[PDB]
Design a protein around this ligand. Structure first.
Ligand SMILES: [Cl-]
Lengths: 99, 86, 89
């Protein structure tokens, strides 16, 4: 009698962890696609920057022409890619245990 | 324990789906400014045939993927709804 | 088990919040470069009243939502925290 209640509970947690694993996978897809868009947008931005620096070359670039502290992009694609790989590993580990 | 944990997961998926929504909204919003900036530079170097020819560089284009992200959000909201119904 | 699952869920929440924090940092970093690029173009077309008037186009402005994202990140870190507290009891 105690066996059946513990196995019915074990089955619910096995099924619940399979759902969590599918939610994690969906979240990893979303972050991958968003990082791809950030990487894509950044290359356009940096080319726009080089373009503005060329047009103001005699003034020493756009930041000196604007008389401002220069803004630089901080690429962090590697760390986001690591966060995604960790989520993908956490999901496969849960899907493994539940089976 | 259970159903409480199931509701807590769905609450977490919801705040996740919302975070991704406002993140995609910012990408879309920034991209429009960048594309208008590009048209601005292509206009200023119209004689040379645009900014990429004036720079003597392979041109960069943004690959918009909002639809794929919006679909992931939809799927996340369907996943949270399932855990609440059961 | 209940406690081992909520401890796994909370670790996953921490990874998501970490991913969103890094993603928002990059958006904020990139946006400062694009708004300086816009100020650069408005300076170059100052006689025409800016790049939007020079292009004769509806002007695009960036809608900054970092605060709203940072609010959701804090909400996630509280959910991971509560799941860890409830895992013991
Ligand atoms: Cl730009």
């Amino acid at each position: 009698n105690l066996y059946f209640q513990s196995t019915k509970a074990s089955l619910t947690y096995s099924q619940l962890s399979k759902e969590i694993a599918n939610n994690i996978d969906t979240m990893a897809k979303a972050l991958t696609t968003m990082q791809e868009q950030i990487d894509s947008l950044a290359a356009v931005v940096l080319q726009n920057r080089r373009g503005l620096d060329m047009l103001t070359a005699a003034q020493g670039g756009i930041c000196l022409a604007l008389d401002e502290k220069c803004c630089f992009w901080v690429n962090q694609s590697g760390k986001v890619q690591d966060n995604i790989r960790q989520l993908l590993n956490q999901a496969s580990s849960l899907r493994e245990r539940a089976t």
